Structure formats: C-alpha cells, structure tokens
Design an enzyme around this catalytic site. Structure first.
Site, PDB file in Angstrom:
ATOM      1  N   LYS B  13     -26.451  10.487  33.677  1.00 37.99           N
ATOM      2  CA  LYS B  13     -26.842  10.248  35.005  1.00 37.99           C
ATOM      3  C   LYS B  13     -25.608   9.681  35.716  1.00 37.99           C
ATOM      4  O   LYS B  13     -24.315   9.784  34.903  1.00 37.99           O
ATOM      5  CB  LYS B  13     -27.741   9.006  34.812  1.00 37.99           C
ATOM      6  CG  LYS B  13     -29.148   9.446  34.518  1.00 37.99           C
ATOM      7  CD  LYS B  13     -30.237   8.148  34.331  1.00 37.99           C
ATOM      8  CE  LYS B  13     -31.572   8.864  34.270  1.00 37.99           C
ATOM      9  NZ  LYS B  13     -32.563   7.640  34.505  1.00 37.99           N
ATOM     10  N   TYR B  53     -38.330  13.785  41.075  1.00 38.36           N
ATOM     11  CA  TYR B  53     -39.271  12.694  40.824  1.00 38.36           C
ATOM     12  C   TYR B  53     -40.412  12.491  41.733  1.00 38.36           C
ATOM     13  O   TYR B  53     -40.952  11.661  41.956  1.00 38.36           O
ATOM     14  CB  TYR B  53     -38.351  11.493  41.259  1.00 38.36           C
ATOM     15  CG  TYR B  53     -37.309  11.091  39.785  1.00 38.36           C
ATOM     16  CD1 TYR B  53     -37.629  10.922  38.567  1.00 38.36           C
ATOM     17  CD2 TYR B  53     -35.871  11.039  40.271  1.00 38.36           C
ATOM     18  CE1 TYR B  53     -36.556  10.924  37.666  1.00 38.36           C
ATOM     19  CE2 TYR B  53     -34.939  11.086  39.421  1.00 38.36           C
ATOM     20  CZ  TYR B  53     -35.258  10.885  38.117  1.00 38.36           C
ATOM     21  OH  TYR B  53     -34.157  10.738  37.295  1.00 38.36           O
ATOM     22  N   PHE B  61     -40.379   1.730  43.241  1.00 34.92           N
ATOM     23  CA  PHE B  61     -38.812   1.925  42.478  1.00 34.92           C
ATOM     24  C   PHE B  61     -38.492   3.137  43.139  1.00 34.92           C
ATOM     25  O   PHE B  61     -37.070   3.466  42.634  1.00 34.92           O
ATOM     26  CB  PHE B  61     -39.236   2.001  41.060  1.00 34.92           C
ATOM     27  CG  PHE B  61     -39.923   3.033  40.415  1.00 34.92           C
ATOM     28  CD1 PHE B  61     -39.478   4.268  40.558  1.00 34.92           C
ATOM     29  CD2 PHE B  61     -41.032   2.650  40.138  1.00 34.92           C
ATOM     30  CE1 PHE B  61     -40.321   5.283  39.744  1.00 34.92           C
ATOM     31  CE2 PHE B  61     -42.170   3.348  39.400  1.00 34.92           C
ATOM     32  CZ  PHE B  61     -41.583   4.726  39.455  1.00 34.92           C
ATOM     33  N   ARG B  89     -35.086  12.390  22.252  1.00 34.89           N
ATOM     34  CA  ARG B  89     -35.714  10.842  22.461  1.00 34.89           C
ATOM     35  C   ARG B  89     -35.231   9.800  21.636  1.00 34.89           C
ATOM     36  O   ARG B  89     -34.764   8.744  21.899  1.00 34.89           O
ATOM     37  CB  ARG B  89     -36.670  10.904  23.016  1.00 34.89           C
ATOM     38  CG  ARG B  89     -37.463  11.327  24.237  1.00 34.89           C
ATOM     39  CD  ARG B  89     -38.986  11.511  24.502  1.00 34.89           C
ATOM     40  NE  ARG B  89     -39.683  10.436  23.940  1.00 34.89           N
ATOM     41  CZ  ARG B  89     -41.068   9.697  24.267  1.00 34.89           C
ATOM     42  NH1 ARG B  89     -41.769  10.686  24.803  1.00 34.89           N
ATOM     43  NH2 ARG B  89     -41.225   8.734  23.786  1.00 34.89           N
ATOM     44  N   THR B  95     -36.031   3.936  26.642  1.00 32.22           N
ATOM     45  CA  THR B  95     -35.498   4.059  27.976  1.00 32.22           C
ATOM     46  C   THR B  95     -35.058   2.711  28.822  1.00 32.22           C
ATOM     47  O   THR B  95     -33.909   2.765  29.459  1.00 32.22           O
ATOM     48  CB  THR B  95     -36.818   4.378  28.800  1.00 32.22           C
ATOM     49  OG1 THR B  95     -37.605   5.700  28.229  1.00 32.22           O
ATOM     50  CG2 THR B  95     -36.570   4.772  30.392  1.00 32.22           C
ATOM     51  N   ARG B 106     -28.721   4.943  25.059  1.00 29.78           N
ATOM     52  CA  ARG B 106     -29.127   3.942  26.043  1.00 29.78           C
ATOM     53  C   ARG B 106     -28.400   2.629  25.690  1.00 29.78           C
ATOM     54  O   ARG B 106     -27.740   1.728  26.347  1.00 29.78           O
ATOM     55  CB  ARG B 106     -30.592   3.834  26.325  1.00 29.78           C
ATOM     56  CG  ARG B 106     -31.140   4.455  27.368  1.00 29.78           C
ATOM     57  CD  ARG B 106     -30.971   5.944  27.284  1.00 29.78           C
ATOM     58  NE  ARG B 106     -31.782   6.605  28.387  1.00 29.78           N
ATOM     59  CZ  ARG B 106     -32.960   7.061  28.079  1.00 29.78           C
ATOM     60  NH1 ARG B 106     -33.639   7.015  27.130  1.00 29.78           N
ATOM     61  NH2 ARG B 106     -33.665   7.695  29.170  1.00 29.78           N
ATOM     62  N   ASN B 116     -29.658   3.831  33.419  1.00 33.20           N
ATOM     63  CA  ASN B 116     -29.550   3.826  32.064  1.00 33.20           C
ATOM     64  C   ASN B 116     -29.074   5.112  31.146  1.00 33.20           C
ATOM     65  O   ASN B 116     -29.500   5.554  30.402  1.00 33.20           O
ATOM     66  CB  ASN B 116     -31.177   3.844  31.514  1.00 33.20           C
ATOM     67  CG  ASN B 116     -31.956   4.963  31.826  1.00 33.20           C
ATOM     68  OD1 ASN B 116     -31.619   5.733  32.812  1.00 33.20           O
ATOM     69  ND2 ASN B 116     -33.087   5.240  31.246  1.00 33.20           N
ATOM     70  N   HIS B 119     -31.110  10.773  31.076  1.00 31.15           N
ATOM     71  CA  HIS B 119     -32.542  11.262  31.187  1.00 31.15           C
ATOM     72  C   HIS B 119     -32.700  12.404  29.997  1.00 31.15           C
ATOM     73  O   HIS B 119     -31.999  13.026  29.611  1.00 31.15           O
ATOM     74  CB  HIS B 119     -32.914  11.817  32.593  1.00 31.15           C
ATOM     75  CG  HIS B 119     -34.113  12.649  32.472  1.00 31.15           C
ATOM     76  ND1 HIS B 119     -35.177  11.916  33.163  1.00 31.15           N
ATOM     77  CD2 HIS B 119     -34.649  13.786  32.181  1.00 31.15           C
ATOM     78  CE1 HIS B 119     -36.302  12.821  33.063  1.00 31.15           C
ATOM     79  NE2 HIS B 119     -35.571  13.801  32.467  1.00 31.15           N
ATOM     80  N   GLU B 130     -39.507  20.321  34.044  1.00 26.46           N
ATOM     81  CA  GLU B 130     -38.232  19.673  34.557  1.00 26.46           C
ATOM     82  C   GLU B 130     -37.123  20.629  34.321  1.00 26.46           C
ATOM     83  O   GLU B 130     -36.052  20.941  35.381  1.00 26.46           O
ATOM     84  CB  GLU B 130     -37.872  18.395  33.852  1.00 26.46           C
ATOM     85  CG  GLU B 130     -38.395  17.171  34.006  1.00 26.46           C
ATOM     86  CD  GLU B 130     -38.321  16.116  33.106  1.00 26.46           C
ATOM     87  OE1 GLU B 130     -37.500  16.056  32.308  1.00 26.46           O
ATOM     88  OE2 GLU B 130     -38.789  14.931  33.625  1.00 26.46           O
TER      89      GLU B 130
END
Lengths: 145, 145
Positions: B13, B53, B61, B89, B95, B106, B116, B119, B130
């Site tokens: 990100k 998204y 948000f 993950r 998250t 994270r 964070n 993704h 995705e």
C-alpha cells in the site's frame, strides 16, 4: 542533496527470480537509499531480449545471452536516488561474480558472469536508453507522499 | 505437494511504498515459500481504487479508503504457492495492526487499520476476482526454469 538525482535500470535476471531472491535484492536497493519508482515482472520474448542488447547482436556471446535472458521471467525496475547509477553498481558488485566484493548482489546470488543475478545500467546515458526501452515515461511513478 | 497450489493478490500500500519497505515485504513472501509470479508498480486513479473496492462503495469508510489507496504508488502482485491465500494472510498478520502478531507485516510496518501496509485476498474466491481486476491472464508469468 549533494549529488544529482539519477534514474537507473535494474533487472532481476531469470536465475535470481527462479531462486526467489527478488525481495532480498529489492531490500538491498532500498537499504542503500534508492527508491523503486517503477517495476514489472515480464517474460521476455526473443525479440524483447535481442532489442535490449542490440548493440551486441554480432558478438559471439549474444545467442547464449539472449537464451538465458528469455529462459524464465525477469523483474525490470527503475531505481531513483542521488548518484543512483554508480550507487546501484556498488550494491551490485562487479559484473563478474568471481571478482565481486563480499556482500554484493553478484557475490551473494551468483557464481558466474553468464548468469549473474542482476543487471544495472552502466552509465547515465545508457540508463536513459534502457529505461526508455522498457517503460513509457508515464509508467514511472514519482513519490507523492 | 500436500495442499492445493493457490494464487492470491498482494498490494504493498502507499504507506509501505513511501517508506521503502517493498523489498522487506517481498522477502517475507519468498521466505515463506510463496512465488511472485506477477508484479507491477502503479499509481491508482480514483476510478481504479473505487472499482477494486466496489463492494463497499456505500460504506462510510469508502471515501477515506479510496483517498489513501490513491495517495501514492502501490505495488500489486500475484503470489503463488501451496495454501497461498491463508499462508499469505499468516505472514500479513491481522488486518488491524494493533491485533497483529509480532513478526507479521502489519505489526512491523503499520500502526493503524486505515493505513495497514499491505493487502491480501481474503479467500480463494476473492483472490480470483482481485487478480483478474489487475492482471490479464497472459500477464502472469509461470516459472519455467
């Protein structure tokens, strides 16, 4: 700032990609203060590789070079920073891994010059050509944060 | 092989890109046995981020998320490996960085859930969507060496 900001081309070659060293190599760039401002993974066609190394098309090593550089995917990137062309070459070490200083990318991730883990532009002039070969200007992503 | 080979989407990100953590994060993927089989740096347009998204377009948000994810360049990648969706993950951690286990991406590269660091696709199904959003199938580069 004390030296001019430059842009230089990196390629993580098919050997280092195949051995999953992309992150380690990128991390070395970033640790040295270079910024990754463009990157993409690509599997080069024969024509792609021949065009990149066109200066050397009549040389004896050309065929093997082209075969190696098309043997698996690569990662092509633009690195930006003060003195980036030479700073990148310092991180890379000598082109010949047998001559490369301890702790350099060539010393740590390669054993012979024919498959030497990574490419870096030789000069500011060649960097301009090499970056333009693989990237549109609008593909490069300046830092905005 | 003991688990199905999966593909999952990674995004580094704008926060983690801006702080030059791309290599460190990639290296974690590779250390865990995942293969980077596609990657590209991009500066997302508003429409790019809104489309990614889109499920959440009516949520409170959404606006801030879209602003953050377009505030600077990102790196989008496809990771391949056994159990890749969940393995990714695990490396990422929770998250919410405040809940993330020590040693996770994270926990190490972020402090709050709104920014964070990275993704990862939530599921095999969402990974398919995705990855297809950002990559043509022929853009993905299987290992050949």
């Amino acid at each position: 700032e004390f030296m001019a900001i430059e842009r230089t081309l990196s390629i993580v070659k098919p050997d280092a990609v195949s051995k999953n060293h992309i992150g380690e190599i990128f991390a070395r760039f970033e640790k040295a203060g270079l910024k990754i401002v463009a990157t993409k993974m690509k599997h080069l066609s024969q024509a792609d590789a021949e065009g990149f190394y066109a200066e050397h098309k009549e040389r004896g090593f050309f065929g093997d070079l082209v075969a190696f550089m098309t043997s698996g995917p690569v990662v092509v990137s633009v690195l930006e920073g003060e003195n980036a062309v030479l700073a990148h070459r310092e991180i890379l070490g000598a082109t010949n891994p047998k001559e490369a200083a301890p702790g350099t990318i060539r010393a740590d991730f390669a054993v012979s010059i024919d498959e030497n883990a990574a490419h870096g532009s030789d000069s500011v002039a060649s960097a301009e050509r090499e970056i333009a070969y693989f990237f549109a200007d609008n593909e490069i992503c300046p830092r905005t944060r």
